[PDB]
Amino acid sequence: SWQAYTDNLIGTGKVDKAVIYSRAGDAVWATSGGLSLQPNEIGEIVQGFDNPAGLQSNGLHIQGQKFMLLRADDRSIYGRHDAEGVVCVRTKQTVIIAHYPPTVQAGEATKIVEQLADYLIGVQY
């Protein structure tokens, strides 16, 4: 029920768009809210989990829009563009990317996406 995860994320209202890619970033397993990434944009994000150097320099591009990297480790990468942002989290088999609008506080968006990541990870995904 990959679709249930993304739908339930946007259902919370803390995230307005979300996509679950395979870890390799080569397959869309679920999408909600029409978030669309170009093949190279998803390639940059996937790599960034291992080496955020590039993302620190050029920024995160989501649908052509540029997001500044804020935080980045082996599992999470957070970005911002004015009052809106993007949360990218890598699990064992997927890469989740979610967008939150200006009407939402980064802390709430982040927490809800991270909680899905906790769930999938504890279940081998």
**Which amino acid is it at 37?**
L
Q: What is the CATH number of the domain that holds 123?
A: 3.30.450.30
Count the domains in the chain. 1
Q: Which domain holds residue 107?
A: 1-125
Place of tokens 């939402």: 104
DSSP-based three-state secondary structure for 94: strand
- Find, among 33, 27, 69, 65, the residue nearest to 48 by Cα: 69
DSSP-based three-state secondary structure for 46: helix
Please state the φ and ψ torsions of residue 15, each to the nearest 5 degrees: -135, 135
Q: In what order do the strands lie in the sheet with 76-81?
A: 28-32, 17-22, 94-100, 84-90, 76-81, 65-72, 60-62
Place of tokens 């994000």: 45
17-22 vs 76-81, strand pairing mode: unpaired
Contact indicator for 112, 93 with CB cutoff of 8 Å: no
